Amino acid sequence: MRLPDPYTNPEYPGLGFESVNLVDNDPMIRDELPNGKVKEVKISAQYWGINISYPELFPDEYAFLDSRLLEYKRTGDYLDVLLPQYEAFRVRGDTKSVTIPAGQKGSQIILNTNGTLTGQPKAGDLFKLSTHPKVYKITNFSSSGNVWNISLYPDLFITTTGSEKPVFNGILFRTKLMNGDSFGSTLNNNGTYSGISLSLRESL
Amino acid sequence: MRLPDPYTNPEYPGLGFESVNLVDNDPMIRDELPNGKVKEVKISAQYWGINISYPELFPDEYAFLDSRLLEYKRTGDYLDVLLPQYEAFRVRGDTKSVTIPAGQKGSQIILNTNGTLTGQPKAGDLFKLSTHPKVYKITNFSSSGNVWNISLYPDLFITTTGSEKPVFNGILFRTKLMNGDSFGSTLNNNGTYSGISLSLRESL
Amino acid sequence: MRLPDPYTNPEYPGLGFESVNLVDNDPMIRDELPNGKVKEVKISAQYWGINISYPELFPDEYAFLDSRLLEYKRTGDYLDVLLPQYEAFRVRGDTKSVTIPAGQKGSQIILNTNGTLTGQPKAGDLFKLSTHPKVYKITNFSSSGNVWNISLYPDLFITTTGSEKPVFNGILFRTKLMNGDSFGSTLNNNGTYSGISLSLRESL
Amino acid sequence: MFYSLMRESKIVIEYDGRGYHFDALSNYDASTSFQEFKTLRRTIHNRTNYADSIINAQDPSSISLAINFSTTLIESNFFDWMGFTREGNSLFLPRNTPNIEPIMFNMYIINHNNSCIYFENCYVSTVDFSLDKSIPILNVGIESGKFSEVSTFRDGYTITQGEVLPYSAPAVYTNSSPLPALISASMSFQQQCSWREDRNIFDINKIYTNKRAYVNEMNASATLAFYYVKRLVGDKFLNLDPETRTPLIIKNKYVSITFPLARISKRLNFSDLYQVEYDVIPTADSDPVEINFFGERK
Amino acid sequence: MFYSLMRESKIVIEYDGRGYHFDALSNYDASTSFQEFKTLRRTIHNRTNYADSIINAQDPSSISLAINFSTTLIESNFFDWMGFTREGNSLFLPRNTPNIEPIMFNMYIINHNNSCIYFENCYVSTVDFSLDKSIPILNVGIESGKFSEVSTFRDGYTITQGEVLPYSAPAVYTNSSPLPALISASMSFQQQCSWREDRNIFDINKIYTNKRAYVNEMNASATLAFYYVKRLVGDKFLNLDPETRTPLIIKNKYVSITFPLARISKRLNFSDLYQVEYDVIPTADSDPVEINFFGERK
Amino acid sequence: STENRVIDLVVDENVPYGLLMQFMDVDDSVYPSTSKPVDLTDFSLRGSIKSSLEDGAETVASFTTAIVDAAQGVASISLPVSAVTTIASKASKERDRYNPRQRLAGYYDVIITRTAVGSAASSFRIMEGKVYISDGVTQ
Amino acid sequence: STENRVIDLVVDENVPYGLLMQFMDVDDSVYPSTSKPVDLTDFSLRGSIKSSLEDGAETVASFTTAIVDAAQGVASISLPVSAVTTIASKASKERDRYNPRQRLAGYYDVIITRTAVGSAASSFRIMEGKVYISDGVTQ
Amino acid sequence: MSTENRVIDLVVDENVPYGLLMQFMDVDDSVYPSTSKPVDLTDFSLRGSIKSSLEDGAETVASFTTAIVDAAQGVASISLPVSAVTTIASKASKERDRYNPRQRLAGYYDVIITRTAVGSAASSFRIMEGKVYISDGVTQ
Secondary structure, eight states: OBOOOTTTOTTOTTOSOSEEEEEEEOOOEEEEOTTSOEEEEOOSOOEEEEEEEOOOBOHHHHHHHHHHHHHHHHHOOOEEEOOSTTOOOOOBSOOTTOBOOSOOOSSEEEEEOOSOOBSOOOTTOEEEESSSOOEEEEEEEEEETTEEEEEESSOOSSOOOSOOOEEOSSOOEEEEESSOTEEEEEEOTTSOEEOOEEEEEEOO | OBOOOTTTOTTOGGGSOSEEEEEEEOOOEEEEOTTSOEEEEOOSOOEEEEEEEOOOBOHHHHHHHHHHHHHHHHHTOOEEEOOGGGOOOOOEEOSSSOBOOSOOOSSEEEEEOTTOEESOOOTTOEEEESSOOOEEEEEEEEEETTEEEEEESSOOSSOOOSOOOEEOSSOOEEEEEOSOTTOOOEEOTTSOEEOOEEEEEEOO | OBOOOTTTOTTOGGGSOSEEEEEEEOOOEEEEOTTSOEEEEOOSOOEEEEEEEOOOBOHHHHHHHHHHHHHHHHHTOOEEEOOGGGOOOOOEEOSSSOBOOSOOOSSEEEEEOTTOEESOOOTTOEEEESSOOOEEEEEEEEEETTEEEEEESSOOSSOOOSOOOEEOSSOOEEEEEOSOTEEOOEEOTTSOEEOOEEEEEEOO | OBOOBSSSEEEEEEETTEEEEOOSEEEEEOEEEEEEEEEOOOOSSOOBOOOEEEEEEEEOOEEEEEEEOBTTOGGGHHHHHHTOEEETTEEEOOSSOSOSSOOOEEEEEEETTTEEEEEEEEEEEEEEEEESSSOOEEEEEEEOSEEEEOSSOOOOSSSBOOSBOOOOOOEEEETTEEOSSEEEEEEEEEEEEEEOOOOOGGGTTSOBOOOOEEEEEEEEEEEEEEEOOOSSTTOSSSSSSOEEEEEEEEEOSSEEEEEEEEEEEEEEEOSSSOEEEEEEEEOSSOOOOEEEEOOSOO | OOOOOSSSEEEEEEETTEEEEOOSEEEEEOOOEEEEEEEOOOOSSOOOOOOEEEEEEEEOOEEEEEEEOBTTOGGGHHHHHHTOEEETTEEEOOSBOSOSSOOOEEEEEEETTTEEEEEEEEEEEEEEEEESSSOOEEEEEEEOSEEEEOSSOOOOSSSBOOSBOOOOOOEEEETTEEOSSEEEEEEEEEEEEEEOOOOOGGGTTSOBOOOOEEEEEEEEEEEEEEEOOBSSTTOSSSSSSOEEEEEEEEEOSSEEEEEEEEEEEEEEEOSSBOEEEEEEEEOSSOOOOEEEEOOSOO | OOOOOBOOEEEETTSOEEEEEEOOEEEOSSSSOEEEOOOOSSBOOEEEEESSSSTTOOEEEEOEEEOOOTTTTEEEEEEOHHHHHHHHHHSOSOBOSSOTTEEEEEEEEEEEOBBSSSSOBOOEEEEEEEEEEEOOSOO | OOGGGOOOEEEETTSOEEEEEEOEEEOOSSSSSOEEEOOOTTBOOEEEEESSSSTTOOEEEOOOOEEEETTTTEEEEEEOHHHHHHHHHHSOOOOOSSOTTEEEEEEEEEEEOBOOTTOOOOOEEEEEEEEEEEOOSOO | OOSSSSOOOEEEETTSOEEEEEEOEEEEOSSSSSEEEEOOOTTOEEEEEEESOSSSSOOEEEOOOOEEEETTTTEEEEEEOHHHHHHHHHTSOSOBOSSSTTEEEEEEEEEEEEOOOSSSOOOEEEEEEEEEEEEOOSOO
C-alpha cells in the first residue's frame, strides 16, 4: 500500500516529511587484523532505512494518517513510500520498449533504450527494477549512444531475466514499520499532534 | 465509573486533560532474517494505553479528583475515559434495529444498517460493540446500499453472536489505573497540588 | 580513490574538513606493579585514525560526496585522505636517485640522499615509503653529509629491500571508512543535509 | 461615527454587587490582546510560506490606574481588596496570607453612547505611592483574565471619591525622634499573584480566558531618600551601619504607614550633595504593618 | 586628498550583467568589518599579557537602503529579486519558496575619483514600507558576504529611477467596504535567509568570505493602526473579535497589497483617543498575496 | 467572516456583462468547513440599478436573473449590452480615484426570494454596493 | 474586465510589434500544475487605440489581430510597422526627464468574442491599459 | 522589466577599435532550470546605428559594422573601426562624468535583428538599446 503524502492527498498539507533520514544498512563481517589490514566480508543483505519526521499534525490529518497506518497493521501488507528529494524527473519517456539483456549479476548493468529515453540519469539518483522491489542507487553513469552503462551501489539481488524494465521515476520503497509495537501520539492544548515520527525499514 | 472531566464537572477546570497520549500497544515478536526479510509474529492482545497529564490543582479540584480515584481503588471498578477529539457525531439514529450477522471473528464487521442510520462513519473514528468493552478504530469503510463494511484495527476480540449492536458515539475506554501502587501528589507551600499523572491501560 | 576535498573540487566548498582528528591508536598492555613501576607490552600494530566533520551540505555537494562514497563502497577501494596542515614542502628534488640500504627493520631509516635532494625534513612531518602504504611521522632527523638519519614513530612495518624510495610530499592516508554499516544523513525541510561524519581508519 | 476619548470616560469597579466609581482619577492605561499559536509547516514536499495561526486564548490584561487621595477614602478599598485586614480606618498587613486565591472583582471602563469594555476576574497586584514635595498619588495595578464589550453596565452614581486631600509635607520618625533632611519617601505594597493556566484539550477550537489565580506572597516595602547629614563626629544615631530592628513610621497629615520593627539598609551616593537611601522592610517577627487613612482632622 | 561624501555617491546594483542605478535614494547605511580569533594563552610558566589575534574572516555586511517610489517602478525588482513571481506589473507571494538559495547579486557604491566599495553575494532580506500621511518610502535590507575596494565599476546610465510618485492617501478595504479611521498602514515582506558558514581547515591562514545561503522562509505581513470607532451598540462589523479569514486590501493610487484571505488579530490601546491595531497575515490556504505597482493612471 | 454583502461591480463599456454566483453553505463546526452547496428551489433574484439612494430615484437599469444548475447551487446575474449602454449614458463624468477609467453609475442590490416554499415569502437581500462603468476604447 | 490587471504595452519604433497570449484554464485543486490549453476555435479578438479616454477621441490605430494556433490556445495581438510609425507620429512629446525614450500614445483595449452557431454574443474584455512608444535611432 | 531587460550601456575607448562579441542562446527556464541551446543565426541579419539625440532630427554619428562570425552556435559581433571611434570622440559632449572623468556622453544607440528568410517570418526585434559613452585616452 501507499503511505499518504501531499502528492497523493494534497488536501492534507500537514502530511509530508519534515525531515527524512535515508540510512545505509549493510551488515558486514569486519575484522581488524593485527598487521593493520582491515578485512570485511559482505554476507547479510543490505537494506535502506527510512526515518520520517512529521510536522505539527492537526486532528483530521492525523486521523487520516493513523487510519492508513492501522490499515497497514491490519492487512499486514507492505507500506510503500515515495521520497520526494529523489523525484527530480530527469528521464522522460516510456520505458516499456527498453530491454535489459538477460544474464547480468553484480553492480554493473547494461540496458538498451532503443532510442526512446530523453534525459541522462546522473550519479546519486535512484534506480529500481520492474520485477524486484529492491531500490538501488546510481553511483556512476556512462552511455555510448543508446546503450547505457549504470553502476549501482547494491549488487543486483536477482540476475536479469531479459524482461525486467527500468524504473527511473516514481520509485517506492517496500518498507515495514519498526515503531508499531509502542506507537503513541500526544495531543496538545493547542490542538495539534506533536512529534509524530516513523522508523521505517525496507523489507527484502 | 467515569473519570472526572470538564464535561460532567466544569466547576473544576483544572481537571481537564492538559495532554492525552493514546498509545498503541500491540506486542509482536519481530525477527530480521539475514536475507533482508523482516518477519513478525503476533500472539498477545492489543490494548489502548492512555496517559493523562494535569496542571497545578487547587485544593477543591484535587479533593474531588482524589475522592474519585480512592472510590475507584476501593470498589475496584473500571475508570471510563472520554477523549473529546473522538466525539464527532457522524452516525445518528437507532442502533437497535441494525443487525450484525453472527460468526464474524476476523478483523472486519459486515452489518446491515436496514436504512435506520443516517450519515456514514469516517476512517480513523472510534467504533465499539455493545456487548464487549474493547474499543476499535475504523481503518476503512465501504457502503454498498444498506450493508456496511467496517474494517477495524484490533482483530475482533469476540465472535459476533448476532445480538451485538454497533456503538459509534458516546464511546468510553474501560481503563484500569496503572502506577497506582505508588500514587502521590506533592502539596506546595502556595496551596496547590502538583505532580499528578494518570497512566491508564485499557483493561477490557 | 581520493576523498573529495576543496583542493580537487573547490566548486563544492561544503566538502572541506571543518575539523580533523588524527587519532594515535597503538594498543598496549599496560600493567602497574605495586612497587610503583609501570610496565607496558606492545604486540598489535599502530594505525592512524582520522575523523572528519562536515557542515550543512547543499544538495549538489551532498550528491557529489554521496556518489563518491557509494563508489567506494561498490568497488571496495581505499579512500585517500589529504591533510592540508601536513603539506609543507621542505624536501624537493628526485626521490629515484636516493638509495635506502636494505635490512632495516627497526624504527629508523638511514638513507644516502646522494646530494640529489635540497632542504631537510623537519621533526613532526609526515614520511612514507614508496612500496608500503603506511604513513610515518618523523620524530627526529640528523644529517651527517649526504646520509640522513630519519627516526619514525611506528616501527617499520616492512623490512627494506633496497628498492624503496622515500616520499616526503604528496602523502595520502590509505584509509578505510569505518561506521559505514549504519551510514546516513538527515535532510532538513530547508533542503540542506546535516549530520554527516566520516570515521576513517588507516587500513594499510 | 462615535470616537472614544479617554478624557470622556468613567471607571467603575464592581465588587460584591456594588459599583465603586473611582473619580479623582488622574490617568489610567490599559490594553487588550489575544494569544496565537502560529506554526509554519515547511516540508520537503512543500516548503510553504503561509503559516497556520489560530487564536485560542485571551492574553491577560494589565490595567494601571493613578488615583488621587480623597476625603471619603474609597481608595483604601484597594488595600482592602488586595488582602489587608481592616480595623476602623487602619489597614493591617497580616502575618500570613489569608486565602490561597486573591479577591476577584470586575471592572468597567464606561464611555459615551453605551460603549464599554468589561474586564473580569481582576485582582489588585500592586499599590505604590511616593510621599514627596508633589501631591501624593497611588498607582494601583490590576490584572484581568477576560475582557469583553458590553452594551449596558454598572455606574457608581453614589459611591464616588470626594475632593482631593490638600498637600501636606511628609515626615519620617523613629519612635518620636524625627529623621532630618527627607527628600522622597516612596512606599510599595504588592500581592504577587500568578495565573494558573488550565488550557486543556477540551478547549480546542475555543478562546480560553484565565479564571483562577493563587497568591505567591504579599509584602510591604518602602524606599526612603535622605541627604547625608551628621551632627557629631563619629555619630551613633546617623551613620551607614545596618539596623536589624528599629521602629519606623512614615507620617503625613492624612496617612501614616507604620513599621513596628524594620530592617533598614543604607546606601550612600556621592552626588552633588551626598544622599543616603534606606531600604525599609518589616522584620521576621514584626507586628503587622499599619496603614492609617485620615480623611480630615485625623 | 580625496574625502568621501555620502551625498556625492551613486549606488548601482549589478544583476544579470545589467546595472540598476537606484536613483531617488533618500538615505543608505552600510558598514564593513572583519572577524578575529583572539585568544590569550596565559600559562603557569608565563602569565602573558599579549593576545594571539589573527584576522581570518570577513563579517557579513548589512546594507540598508531607503528608496522613494518612482514612475518607472525599478524598485519592484527588489520584490522580484527577493523571490516573488511576476505577472505583468503585479508581484505574487508564491505558495512555496521556489529555490533553496536566494537570488544573488552584486552592488556598487560609487564615489568620485574612481573610488568604490564592491559588495558581492548580496540578497534582499527585508522590504517594508509604511503607507501613512507622509510620503511612502520602502526600506530594503540586503546582506553581503564579501566586500572589496575596486578601481573601475558598473554605472547605470540608462536603468534609473524616474520622478518620485506624488503622495496619495492610503485606504484599506474589506472587499469593497472601506474601513474607517485609518492612521498608519505598515507593510512588511521578508526573505529570512541564513548564511551557511563553511570555514574549514583548508582556509587556515586565509580570509574567509561567506558565499552560499539558504532560505528559511518567506512571508508577507502588515500592521494596521485604526481609531477605535463603533457605529452601533453591539456592532458586528467593527469589534475586537478575531477574524479567521477575511479578504483585505491596503490600497493606494499607485500600489495595492492584496490579501485574498487574512488572519486579523486586534489590539486596543486606551490612549488619548482609543486606537485599535490589526495584525494581518495571510491564512494557510489563502491565494498568493498580491503587490501591484501602478506608475500613472493605474 | 461577519458580513461582506458590500461588493462593487465594475461593468465594461461596449461589452455585455455577466456574473456567475456559486451559492454555497459553509459551516465551521468541523475544522474542515463543510462545502455543502445550497439547493436552488423556489428561488428568484431581483436587482435594479438606481442612481443614488434618495426616494424617487430614476431606475438606470434592471438586472436580468438567470437560474441554472439548481442542484449545485450556482446562478447567474446578467444584463444585455443595450443595458450596459443605457447605464453608461447616465454615469457621472467624475472618475474614480484609484482607476481613471471607472465612473460611478448608481447603486444596486439583489434580493433572493422563496415564494411559498412553505407558505412563506422569505426574501432577503444577498449583496449590495456601487456599480462602476469602465470606459472602453474599442468602440 | 480586469481592473487590477492593467498592463501598459511598449512598442518599439521602426520595428513591427508582436504580442502573443495563451488562453489556458487551470484547476489545481486535484493537483498543482493542472492546466489545459483552451480551445480558441471560432474566437475572434479585436481592439483599437484612441488618443484620449473619452467619447469623441480620435482613433490612432487598430491592432491586426489573428489566431495563430486554433485549439492550442495561442492567440496573437499585433500591428505592422506602418501602424507603429503612425503611432509614433501621433504620440505626445512630453518626454520624461529620466525615461526619455517612452512617450504616451493613447489607451487600448481588446475584446474576445464567440461567433458560434447555436450560441449568442460572448464579448469579453481581456486587455486594458496604455500604449507607450519607445524611441528609436537606427531606423 | 517592460524595457529594463534589453538595455545595456557601451563605452567605446578612444583611439582603439571597439568590438563587442555577442552570443545568442535560447535558454529554457520555465519548463526546467539549467537548459540552454544556441540559436541558429542563419539568415538573422543585424544592423545598428548611433545618434546624438532622440529628437526627430538627429545626426548619425556612427553605425555598427555588424557581422555574423558563426552562422550556427548563435555567435555574432557588432564592431566599429578606429575612424568611427575618433568621430564619436570628436562629436561627443564636453561634460565629463564626475564618478569617472574619462567618460563623456556620446549619444544613443539601437540594434535591430532582421530574420529575413524564404519562410514568411520576416520579423524584426530590437535586442539592444542604451547610451554610448566615450572614454578619453592619451596614448594616441
